[PDB]
Amino acid sequence: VQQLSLFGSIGDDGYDLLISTLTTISGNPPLLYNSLCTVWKPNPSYDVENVNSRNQLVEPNRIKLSKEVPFSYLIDETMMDKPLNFRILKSFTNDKIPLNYAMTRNILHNESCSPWSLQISDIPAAGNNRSVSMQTIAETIILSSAGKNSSVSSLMNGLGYVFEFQYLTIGVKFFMKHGLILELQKIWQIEEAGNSQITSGGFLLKAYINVSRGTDIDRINYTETALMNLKKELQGYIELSVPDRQSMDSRVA
Amino acid sequence: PYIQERLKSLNDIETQLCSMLQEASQVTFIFGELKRGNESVKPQFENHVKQFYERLDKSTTQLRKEIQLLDENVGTRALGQDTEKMEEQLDLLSAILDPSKSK
């Protein structure tokens, strides 16, 4: 899959406004969502060349397991209660939900496992000046597991990977025109020695479109336009820009 | 909404401006009598005169102030789909209730 995207940010200050605005531009409400991502690297004990049985220069990369956490495993207070995601995010700022996230990695709270989104991405498309961030993603869905060691952690080890780092993200997304999505988000590093919000101070803004093609230059070029239109329409309110490629490279590093 | 107040403050400033006119109009006809040598109402001439100055200075502060306020308001921070979609039911449902039993 091809993910064309634009990024930016707002302090928690700007959120309230941005929201009211984004709802009008898109005509849909923001919808509350979250997801945990667990990153894995090749087992540093094993060691392998960078070539195939089909002499191909192939680089080691990280794997990313992603999925939803039902909010019941995430939220601090019922008193706050409510359905509203933005006023709720202030509640979440600076610091962690229950987490300790290890628990879920190996079941608990005699067990099989969930579905995951197993992904691996390449550095965004080399480009002298790109109007948009264009990134390739290889994905498969894991449906459930079976066998002796059926915990997701066992599975990853069986395949020769090792857990590297992880993070939770909670936000609202806007469903929009021609597959355009806008996520207003917050990210939290999850370690065993406690959790900290990566996005502390505000929200990561991501406007994107996943395209099935890649090899339909036309739909690719259409997609560029879509993103451009957005950045443009909001220009003078918020700049959507292309992130540094180097900063989106999940390789060995 | 409660801005309808600020709206009425300006619509009244508007009537203040139509007074700048109404007042200085007397200043016109009254200075008519005055240079005609008939010093008859010279005090009254002075009155409606500082009054045209007064009305426009009040208007001047009032709309200038209103502009300051709008800048301050500016500094301060489809809807169709939403309510309508649900509310469909609320009316037809309540009415279907009504034709089933009543009074």
Binding site: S9, G202, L204, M248 | -
Partner: peptide, 22 residues
């Protein structure tokens, strides 16, 4: 009447998400 007239680094955030560089 007379008078006179960022919350953080976008790039680095992303850097983290991809490598765990913080």
């Amino acid at each position: 009447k007379h008078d006179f007239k960022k919350p953080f680094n976008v790039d680095d955030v992303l850097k983290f998400t991809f490598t765990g560089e913080k």
